[PDB]
Write a protein that binds this DNA or RNA. Sequence first.
RNA 1: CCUAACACAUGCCUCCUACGGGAGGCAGUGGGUUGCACAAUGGGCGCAAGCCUGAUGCA
RNA 2: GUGCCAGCAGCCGCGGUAAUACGGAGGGCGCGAGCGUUACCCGGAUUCACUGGGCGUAAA
RNA 3: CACCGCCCGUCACGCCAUGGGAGCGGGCUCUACCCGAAGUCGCCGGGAGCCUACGGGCAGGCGCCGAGGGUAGGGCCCGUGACUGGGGCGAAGUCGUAAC
RNA 4: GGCCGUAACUAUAACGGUCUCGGGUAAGUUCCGACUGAUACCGCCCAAGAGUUCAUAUCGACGGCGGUGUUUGGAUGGCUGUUCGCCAUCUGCUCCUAGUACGAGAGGACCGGAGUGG
Lengths: 124, 121
Amino acid sequence: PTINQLVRKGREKVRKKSKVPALKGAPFRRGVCTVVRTVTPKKPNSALRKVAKVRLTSGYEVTAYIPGEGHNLQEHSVVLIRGGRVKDLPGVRYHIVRGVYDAAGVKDRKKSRSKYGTKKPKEA
Amino acid sequence: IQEQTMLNVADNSGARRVMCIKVLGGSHRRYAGVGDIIKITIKEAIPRGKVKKGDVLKAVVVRTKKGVRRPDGSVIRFDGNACVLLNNNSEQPIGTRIFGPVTRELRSEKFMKIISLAPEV
RNA sequence: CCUAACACAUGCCUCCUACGGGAGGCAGUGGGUUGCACAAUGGGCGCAAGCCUGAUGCA
RNA sequence: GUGCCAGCAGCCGCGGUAAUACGGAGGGCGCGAGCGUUACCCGGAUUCACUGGGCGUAAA
RNA sequence: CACCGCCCGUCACGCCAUGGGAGCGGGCUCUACCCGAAGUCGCCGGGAGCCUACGGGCAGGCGCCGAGGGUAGGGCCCGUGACUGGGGCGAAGUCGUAAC
RNA sequence: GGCCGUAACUAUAACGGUCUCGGGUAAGUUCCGACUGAUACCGCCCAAGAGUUCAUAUCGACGGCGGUGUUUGGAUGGCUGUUCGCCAUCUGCUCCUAGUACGAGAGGACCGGAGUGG
């Protein structure tokens, strides 16, 4: 654009668009499960990912992924969503914190336990 | 007081006009003023409240132009038309307070909540 | 307390009524540490002494 | 041990009977009254390029 | 898995998803007219009151402004929504065979 | 213009072949947006069955006999022209008896009386 044009119209600042309406731009948001179904992967993957519809305290009701070997998530089980997409499950923008609320941590975890809310295995 | 007839709320949660659609007391009660029970129907209401719009309930009659007299014969006529809805089948006057004056006959035994409010008569 | 400028017992709409009529910061409670002190600095008042001071100095 | 299951997963991916990628164990690496996670900001990003970018066929 | 290949559209089913929108309700930003508290202020304050050193003061009265309320219309975007549209992918749905 | 087969749960079938829902309403069929007695009705007769058991508390198969004159015949409102229908919404209530009799509780009389209503 000409300098004169810039002066007239000028540049337009870019607007970032949140990819996690965990509303109130919170770091985490807790809600309640509606359904603990299972979903099939996308384009080139196969498996039965464990998922859950969640009624947020933020008013929203979204689909969150359940990380880990095996959960203990039911219905009216209170849980904490944390935001994190999952390339294979579209419509799934958050992971479910394991080790918080009704989401029991992964049993028999010995590695990245922190990312699975499982205490330090008392080694004898 | 005969069907139709616009009656105002004198208590709360469902403002203004309220439609009387019946008169109990039995077969052919034409009217019912003073302080009788009357099947009502909310038609306006404030956006808020726990009683929306068009909720077929019953209610009482507080201030009615037809007047009320007794004794001596003197009369207290209030030019208005007071309802004051009551939570329907577990009968009782729903609400918190009552507005304006009330009637001394309204103090009828079994009622009583309503008259310890609306500081008047 | 980054949320609820949400509602607040006690000490520093809700409640009472004789239905006529009335009353409504510090620490803590519910909902989504109720600590010590005038010693010091500063302030109010005082002729000063000193009194007040959940500022504040401390724990 | 399990056998495209159960599961891992930040990205690429790993698991369909020899899996250093799942689960445990032995051993090891790193930190240590901490360690790990999530969230957000800057970085990496000369990927808004003033420093310091470009437009024949890649976006232009 | 290479012409016994590939492949398109209608309609139908599957995992999934969703827009437009008349009105109805509510909010923001208001217009017009009617009612209008407290209070300051303005005028009266009189053989209508109280006080007076007769100068005046107070009570009281009226009035403007005025929080707010009322009837009609408009704005906000949030809600619901009979009405209507309907898209991405799909191994062995249906009718054809458009394309390569 | 017809008839037939057909894709991922069905349903539909692009393909192949072949000759009621929403709105307004408390409620909206409107509105707006998508002589005779066959027959009938009413009664009775028999009693296989059902009713845990037990035909007849209640009902009653297979069949049977009649009576009537009546069908087919020879309380305010919403909707509608409706009748009808669907939908909204003299005697009551209360108290005493007595929260007693009865009842596991839940609940709740008789008889008799008293007041106030449509």
